[PDB]
Amino acid sequence: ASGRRAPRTGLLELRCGAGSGAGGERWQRVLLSLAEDALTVSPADGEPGPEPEPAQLNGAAEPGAAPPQLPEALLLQRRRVTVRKADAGGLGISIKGGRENKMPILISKIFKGLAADQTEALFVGDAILSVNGEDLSSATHDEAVQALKKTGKEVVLEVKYMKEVSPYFKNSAGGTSVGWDSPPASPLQRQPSSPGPQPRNLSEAKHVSLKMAYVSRRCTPTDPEPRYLEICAADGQDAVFLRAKDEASARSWAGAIQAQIGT
């Protein structure tokens, strides 16, 4: 099953037992799949599958010098360039750095059109740090040369596009909405309704419609920013609340559900 589009799936912290007693909480990891107008929850795995040692067996694409169709999502961060001598060719760039004080190593030039040239992945404006699978951030310029110079066959250089890493003046991160926590009227008697069909059980999957769903943000477990999200299905069908790994992960979660539902 694969039709271009794909629902955003991620792990979140969901509570258990604490529904209307408050006598023994329990937060566990749970996977959440948000497509568009529907969210399908499900448990996550634990044992590791794909090892970080293997690196394909040279194939996929015949031409070029790297398996095309490289998705971003969680890989769009920094850059993982490579230099294959037994495929692309030799390297000929002019770097410059000086960590002796506080000058990070970066691309100063790309002499001729060597492997460094054909490798668009790299360009005169990136700072190296993790090469051939080894962070040498604590290896001044000289060490940078020997790091990529000693390598061979496949030099996986991991650089970071440094530009506006240090913003100017305070004008981001931080805000006080205040006012979205005082409803005019909220029935607290005709909510439970008569006992009958109510999809509020946790078995294996928790599918909920994003038609009249609501997203909330409450803090408690030492959450002075991230906080846990709350998904109330029209406050009359279901209510799944969970917290992400980082504050941003929740910003994207609540931001994705809110931007999707738009109730």
From Swiss-Prot:
GO terms for biological process: neuromuscular junction development; regulation of vasoconstriction by circulating norepinephrine. Residues 80-163 form the PDZ domain. Residues 5-262 form the PH domain. The modification Phosphoserine is found at S94, S177, S182, S186, S193. It is a peripheral membrane protein. Phosphorylated by CaM-kinase II. Phosphorylation may inhibit the interaction with DMD. It is found in: Cell membrane, Sarcolemma; Cell junction; Cytoplasm, Cytoskeleton. One of its GO terms (cellular component) is cytoplasm. One of its GO terms (molecular function) is transmembrane transporter binding. Keywords: Actin-binding, Calcium, Calmodulin-binding, Cell junction, Cell membrane, Cytoplasm, Cytoskeleton, Membrane, Phosphoprotein, Repeat. High expression in skeletal muscle. Expressed at intermediate level in heart, kidney and brain, and at low level in intestine, liver, lung and testis. Residues 39-67, 176-202 are annotated as: Disordered. Its main location: membrane. Adapter protein that binds to and probably organizes the subcellular localization of a variety of membrane proteins. May link various receptors to the actin cytoskeleton and the extracellular matrix via the dystrophin glycoprotein complex. Plays an important role in synapse formation and in the organization of UTRN and acetylcholine receptors at the neuromuscular synapse. Binds to phosphatidylinositol 4,5-bisphosphate. Monomer and homodimer. Interacts with MAPK12, TGFA, GA and F-actin. Interacts with the other members of the syntrophin family: SNTB1 and SNTB2; with dystrophin protein DMD and related proteins DTNA and UTRN; SGCG and SGCA of the dystrophin glycoprotein complex; NOS1; GRB2; calmodulin and the sodium channel proteins SCN4A and SCN5A. Interacts with MYOC; regulates muscle hypertrophy. Interacts with DTNB. Belongs to the syntrophin family. The PH 1 domain mediates the oligomerization in a calcium dependent manner, and the association with the phosphatidylinositol 4,5-bisphosphate. The PDZ domain binds to the last three or four amino acids of ion channels and receptor proteins. The association with dystrophin or related proteins probably leaves the PDZ domain available to recruit proteins to the membrane. This is Alpha-1-syntrophin.
